Amino acid sequence: NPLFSPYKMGKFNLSHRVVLAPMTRCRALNNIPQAALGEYYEQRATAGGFLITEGTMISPTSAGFPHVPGIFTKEQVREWKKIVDVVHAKGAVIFCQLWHVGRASHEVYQPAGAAPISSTEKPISNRWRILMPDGTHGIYPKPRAIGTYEISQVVEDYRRSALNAIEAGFDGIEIHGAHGYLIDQFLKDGINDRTDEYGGSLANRCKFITQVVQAVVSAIGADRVGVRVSPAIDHLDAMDSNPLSLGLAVVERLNKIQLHSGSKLAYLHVTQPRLMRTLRNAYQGTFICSGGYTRELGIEAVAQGDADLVSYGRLFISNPDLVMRIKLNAPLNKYNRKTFYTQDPVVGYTDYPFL
Numbered sequence: 628n629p630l631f632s633p634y635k636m637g638k639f640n641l642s643h644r645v646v647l648a649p650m651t652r653c654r655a656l657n658n659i660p661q662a663a664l665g666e667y668y669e670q671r672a673t674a675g676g677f678l679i680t681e682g683t684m685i686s687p688t689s690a691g692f693p694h695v696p697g698i699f700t701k702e703q704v705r706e707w708k709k710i711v712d713v714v715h716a717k718g719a720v721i722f723c724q725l726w727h728v729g730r731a732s733h734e735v736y737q738p739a740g741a742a743p744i745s746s747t748e749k750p751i752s753n754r755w756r757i758l759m760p761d762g763t764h765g766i767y768p769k770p771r772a773i774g775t776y777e778i779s780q781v782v783e784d785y786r787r788s789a790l791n792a793i794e795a796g797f798d799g800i801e802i803h804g805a806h807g808y809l810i811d812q813f814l815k816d817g818i819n820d821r822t823d824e825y826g827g828s829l830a831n832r833c834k835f836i837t838q839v840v841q842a843v844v845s846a847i848g849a850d851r852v853g854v855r856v857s858p859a860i861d862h863l864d865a866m867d868s869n870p871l872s873l874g875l876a877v878v879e880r881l882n883k884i885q886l887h888s889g890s891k892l893a894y895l896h897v898t899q900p901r902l903m904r905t906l907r908n909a910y911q912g913t914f915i916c917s918g919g920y921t922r923e924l925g926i927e928a929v930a931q932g933d934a935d936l937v938s939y940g941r942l943f944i945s946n947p948d949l950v951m952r953i954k955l956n957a958p959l960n961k962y963n964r965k966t967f968y969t970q971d972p973v974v975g976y977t978d979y980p981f982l
């Protein structure tokens with residue numbers, strides 16, 4: 628089974644290619660990692676296995692979901708250290724995903740009830756609705772379009788959060804550049820309506836992700852940095868007129884960052900809703916594919932050279948031992964969407980059984 632051949636993800640020797648995809652679960656009450664997160668990640672950790680955390684706030688203005696963790700305060704660092712230690716005790720490698728939602732927020736999630744930030748002043752349309760802390764769905768508000776000083780300060784929030792992740796003991800970080808969140812609001816020509824140096828051309832639209840990646844690479848080293856993008860996912864009104872050219876432009880910038888720093892990123896992670904293989908073939912380094920994989924599709928992805936690692940989201944929610952079940956070809960257990968984003972520390976979180 629090619630999912631069980633070892634793979635060297637730069638400094639990390641992985642024993643198998645089954646990755647835990649980043650998944651927001653909303654159990655980090657008041658944005659503080661809780662003991663329940665330790666139990667959840669410990670259950671899914673395996674010796675030589677790679678795990679990516681739920682998206683994690685980089686600043687007080689970065690959230691658009693309830694009870695998501697941050698890594699911008701020292702209290703959050705101290706609590707994440709306890710989770711990282713239990714995962715490392717199982718021999719697993721873990722990266723923290725750094726997540727800023729940009730315009731995909733609401734006054735209830737912002738300090739002082741202020742408008743969320745973005746590349747643009749346009750709101751997500753009412754085709755989409757935001758999950759509220761009480762479980763209802765609300766209306767995305769108009770964001771405020773930030774200037775270039777504020778862009779540079781958001782870049783600094785990613786830099787400081789990456790340093791905090793290393794302080795908590797994470798092996799590295801993943802930049803969340805996918806799914807219509809802040810970085811994608813700069814990348815996608817369906818959103819970015821700027822006329823300054825961060826808008827118009829494809830090159831200008833790629834400036835923000837390039838600067839985020841360069842800052843975290845400078846702070847923690849490229850081998851501790853993964854980057855996640857989704858050029859073909861149009862969630863939250865985040866379409867591009869040419870998804871493949873946008874993906875190849877991002878890949879080119881990643882390749883240039885690596886050549887200039889003299890070091891390779893941990894990986895490029897692309898999640899989908901031929902494009903995938905084209906981006907993989909253009910990127911000088913490790914490729915993680917994601918979206919709709921099953922045991923057989925992940926085996927095929929690695930066997931046919933389409934990816935080096937395969938990340939699983941929903942199946943890992945309900946199969947804590949997904950790695951072993953894939954190894955044994957044991958039947959997988961269903962997941963319950965109703966408890967994806969609830970707050971209970973156990974129900975639908977750590978109470979899915981093992982084999």
Ligand SMILES: Cc1cc2nc3c(=O)[nH]c(=O)nc-3n(C[C@H](O)[C@H](O)[C@H](O)COP(=O)(O)O)c2cc1C
Nearest residue numbers: 648649650651681682898918919920939940941967
């Ligand atoms: C409940 C849930 C939460 C998610 N949260 C995140 C997240 O925090 N960051 C992210 O990049 N993707 C997130 N995703 C997308 C997943 O990482 C993954 O790409 C997606 O579920 C498609 O893969 P799958 O078919 O293996 O589930 C989330 C998906 C789900 C279902």
